[PDB]
Amino acid sequence: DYRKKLLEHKEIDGRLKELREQLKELTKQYEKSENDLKALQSVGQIVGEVLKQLTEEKFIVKATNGPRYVVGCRRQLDKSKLKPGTRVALDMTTLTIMRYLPREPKGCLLYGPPGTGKTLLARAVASQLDCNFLKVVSSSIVDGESARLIREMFNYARDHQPCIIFMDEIDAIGGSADREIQRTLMELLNQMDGFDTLHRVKMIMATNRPDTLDPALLRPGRLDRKIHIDLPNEQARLDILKIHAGPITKHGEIDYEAIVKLSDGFNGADLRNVCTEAGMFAIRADHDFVVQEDFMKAVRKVADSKKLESK
Amino acid sequence: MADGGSERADGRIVKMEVDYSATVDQRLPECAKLAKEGRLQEVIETLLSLEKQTRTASDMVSTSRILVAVVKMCYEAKEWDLLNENIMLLSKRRSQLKQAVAKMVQQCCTYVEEITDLPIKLRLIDTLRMVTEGKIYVEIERARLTKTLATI
Amino acid sequence: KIMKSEVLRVTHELQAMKDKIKENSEKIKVNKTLPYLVSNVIELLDVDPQRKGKCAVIKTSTRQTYFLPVIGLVDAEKLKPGDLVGVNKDSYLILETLPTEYDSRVKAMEVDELDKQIQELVEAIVLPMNHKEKFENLGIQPPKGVLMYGPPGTGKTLLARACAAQTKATFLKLAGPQLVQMFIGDGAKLVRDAFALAKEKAPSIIFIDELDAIGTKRFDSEKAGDREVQRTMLELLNQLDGFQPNTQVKVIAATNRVDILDPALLRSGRLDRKIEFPMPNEEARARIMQIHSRKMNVSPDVNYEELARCTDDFNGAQCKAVCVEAGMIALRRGATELTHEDYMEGILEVQ
């Protein structure tokens, strides 16, 4: 009789202490609201730019709207960032300064004639680390006024030290109509063989066939290494097949060895589409479970169709 | 396609047992055109993973009982890129070469303990020059041969 | 339960908080109710050396640049270089950010409120709005890009438009030449804006046509006017590949001629379904024509043989045009009910 009261009181105290999580969690957000309300107290800041400076303590500022003014020096900030050539900020009162306003294997060759899926690997690396997010279009020309645009992009590449370049379908630009093309090529040569540090920035090129790819431009100089991908690796294909077999339940007896072995000259995304097509083919039998027999047949047929349409 | 070369390979391993190196010399023009053809990169991988094993098997037979080793090293010394001379198109496989050199240095590793005194210094003085002449490698076997030479 | 007696005080403090937030939550409504103008916001990351560096770049419609950090309530879809933000007098702060897109005009393109193949098509367009709940157990990933093509004379345009009515969702209209303009660099803006509207709005239906003409890679090396939609398509595929949001609303593409095809269009996110039309039959066209004409008043005696036989290499819109033409002279015939011979008469009339 006395032993059950402890359990009962444990239940009451339990449901009493379990109702706090519906409050104390959102109280932090409610407090954060007023915190933001107190964070909105700072207003009336304007901008400015520094050109000429006479006195080290007090310099001249240039507004974006075009009128010119002069300000002093705040006891907080130092003379380190006070140097000219840096866009700063100003206040509507006393024209003080809260802070400033900052402005905003060296090569590889990938040729894809047997199929595709290199972009899937590049996407895998990009989703892995990639050190940054950047993409270079195949043709920046149609966007002779694109030269300054290329030099601008490379200027940004010099601005941000870490860089990785991804270029897909470069065989299009690899091929007075031809004269301007040759001129653009000469510009590319001038830019790549100019003065720059390639030990950091990395470039990746994706393409189709080794014809318009300019083997002279595929030279060791303008491209260190070349890697040929015929198809995803056996371990890689098995792995991606395993992770694609995760959400879909199958029969107790399962063999991926047949699926992997019978697959020749196929691509990951394509094979995934074949798998989904096999699922939609096996959904016609309205069964919750699907044997690998129908899977093997459907995969075989669909892949054969893809081989017939591979032209 | 390597399907035709496979029959030649597994036929070769059966037909070649007690025969001398003359049959290999007769096998040279046969393997020459075989190296000339097969433009396909992926297809002939098997053929390159077979025929090489066959000729190295013949080399094993020649190095089994009686070995002059002069002609053996002279053949490879005189012929390196000779098979690739007729082909203007760049092979750029960079696949079977590693396994090739690894197998060669594997056999050389089996013979590295005790065989005979004279040929080994010639083989080493040849391959250390091959390191320089090659200029492209995974930089494994190249260090292997020279460090295993250094140990001596 | 003597140790749990201190919880009551905590609850009293919490309800006291709920009582004391009434005023500060009340002033929000009267303060933020009327932003006086609209300014452009550009996000720029600064560095203070908590004291974490935070800033932003503002552009007023009066062309006056000011200074201000990133503030306001909890942000989710914010921090993007959009427009239409709430601002008070002299404060230049950010309260409510709503995206209406940029240069609206492209967006208001249009407002819209063979059995074996059309069955597969209907199932295909229905399943992403249906089987999503069953896609967890079955693990079936729905295709995104769907390529609908075939020989000229099919009438697939108004057929897909008819399926759009079956989807019950909103339908949009975008053509090939619509992507070609006098300006430059329009592709990226168009794609990003379209995906923005697709992100903000309901899972509507998007259908584009003539991807073959604007996707021509021009084997001939001499000259041509449009290289733009090529890289626009490349960028489209890039965003349909390297982006997780691509699981969102699908984009349907169609090509008239098979002469030009891009091998890189094969993917789940990209074009997947490929259906060739092998000289579509007659009786089916008669069936859909019956479905279309079932509303109008017609004498219920039809052999269907003559009208099925007289139709050769004709669109669906051309069949509807045959129906309309049949309704044209039926008005001046004096008859209040459409007859059988009027159909074939219309066929021999307009065609």
| Cβ atoms of C213 and C256 closer than 8 Å | yes
Q: Which residue of C has its CA nearest to A18?
A: C7
At residue C198, what is the residue type?
Answer: A
Amino acid symbol at C217: K
C177 is in an annotated binding site: no
DSSP A217-275: TSSSTT-SEEEE-SS--HHHHHHHHHHHSSSS---SS--SHHHHHT--S--HHHHHHHH
Residue C264 and residue A116: Cβ atoms within 8 Å? yes
Among residues 141-160 of chain A, which lie with CB inside 8 Å of chain C? 141-143
Look-up of token digits 């009327």: C34
Distances from the Cα of A123 to the Cαs of A127, C53, C267, C312, in angstroms? 6, 31, 13, 48
Q: Are C342 and C329 in contact (CB under 8 A)?
A: yes
- Residues near C320 by Cβ (< 8 Å), separated by ≥ 6? C158, C289, C292
Contact (Cβ atoms closer than 8 angstroms) between residue C314 and residue C155: yes
CB contact B92 to A (< 8 Å): yes
C250, C206 contact by CB (below 8 A)? yes
Nearest CA among C126, C238, C266 for reference residue A274: C266
Q: What are phi and psi of C20, to 5 degrees?
A: -95, -5
Which DSSP helix (H) or strand (E) runs through A7?
helix A2-17
Q: For C102, which DSSP code?
A: S
Count of Cβ atoms closer than 10 Å to residue C179 Cβ: 21
Q: How far is it, in rounded angstroms, from Cα C151 to Cα C145?
A: 20
Contacts of A114 in chain B (CB under 8 A): 41-42
How many beta carbons lie within 10 A of that of residue C115, not counting itself?
Answer: 11
Cα-Cα-Cα-Cα dihedral sign, residues A263, A268, A274, A280: positive
A176's CB contacts (< 8 A; 6+ apart) are none
B75: number of Cβ within 10 Å: 14
Q: In sequence order, what are the residues at sequence separation of 6 or more whose Cβ sits closer than 8 angstroms to the Cβ of residue A299?
A: A259, A262, A263, A274, A275, A278
Q: At a CB cut-off of 8 Å and minimum separation 6, what does C188 contact? A: C232, C235
CB–CB of B90 and A215 under 8 A?
Answer: yes
Is there a contact between A214 and A184 (Cβ–Cβ < 8 Å)?
no
Closest in A114, A215, A226 to B42, CB measured: A114
Considering all CA atoms of chain C, what is the largest pairwise distance in Å, rounded to the nearest integer? 98
Q: Are A16 and A8 in contact (CB under 8 A)?
A: no
Residue of A268, A118, A105 whose CA lies nearest to A205: A118
Describe the crossing of helices C316-332 and C341-350 by its angle, rounded to 10 degrees: 110
Q: Which residues 3-62 of chain A have a CB within 8 Å of chain C? A: 9, 12-13, 16-17, 20, 23-24, 27, 29-30, 32-34, 36-37, 39-40, 42-47
| Parallel, antiparallel or unpaired: strands C56-60 and C205-208 | unpaired
Helix pair A234-244, A268-282: axis angle to 10 deg: 40
**CA-to-CA distance for A280 and A248, rounded, in angstroms?**
12
The residue to which tokens 């989703």 are assigned: A127
Q: What is the 8-class DSSP label of residue A167?
A: E
Closest CA of chain C from A11, distance in Å:
11
Instruction: Tell me how far CA of residue C224 lies from CA of A142, C178, C216, in angstroms.
Output: 11, 18, 10
Question: Experimental method for this entry?
Answer: cryo-EM
C327 is in an annotated binding site: no
Which residues in chain C are contacts of A119 at CB distance < 8 A?
241, 264
Distance in angstroms (rounded) separating the CA atoms of residues A51 and A84:
6
Q: Which residue has the tokens 């669109």?
A: C315
- Which residues sit opposite C148 in a β-bridge? C254, C275
Chains A and C touching, counted as 3 or more CB pairs less than 8 Å apart: yes
| B90 contacts chain A (CB < 8 A) | yes
Task: Show the tokens assigned to C230.
Answer: 């090529």
Using the beta-carbon criterion (under 8 Å), do A27 and C217 form an inter-chain contact? no
CB half-sphere exposure, A57, CA atoms < 13 A: 1
CA distances from B17 to B12, B30, B60, B72, B132 (A): 9, 18, 11, 18, 36
Do A63 and A69 touch, CB atoms closer than 8 A?
yes
Question: What resolution in angstroms, rounded to 1 decimal?
Answer: 6.8
Q: Are A249 and A281 in contact (CB under 8 A)?
A: no
- DSSP E strand boundaries for chain A: 45-50, 60-62, 68-70, 88-91, 108-111, 164-167, 202-207, 225-228
Report the distance separating Cα A21 and Cα A9, nearest Å: 20
DSSP character string of C214-279: TT---SS-S--S--HHHHHHHHHHHHTTS-GGGGSS-EEEEES-SS---GGG-SSSSEEEEE---S
Identify all chain A residues contacting C44, using CB atoms and an 8 Å cutoff. 101-102, 104
Residue of B nearest to A220 (CA): B136
Structure token digits, residue A295: 């899977």
Q: Compute the distance between CA of residue C42 and CA of residue C83 in angstroms, rounded to an integer.
A: 9
Q: How many CB atoms lie within 10 A of CB C251?
A: 24
Instruction: Tell me if C171 sits within 8 A of C207, measured CB to CB.
Output: yes
Spell out the alpha helix ranges (H) of B37-140.
Answer: 45-48, 51-62, 70-78, 96-110, 118-134
Question: Between A27, A39, A279, which is nearest C140 by CB?
Answer: A279
CA distances from A162 to A136, A202, A206, C33, C47 (A): 15, 9, 21, 45, 18
Please indicate if the annotation marks A118 as binding a ligand. Answer: yes
The residue with tokens 């403090």 is C13
| Phi, psi angle pair for B41, to nearest 5° | -70, -50
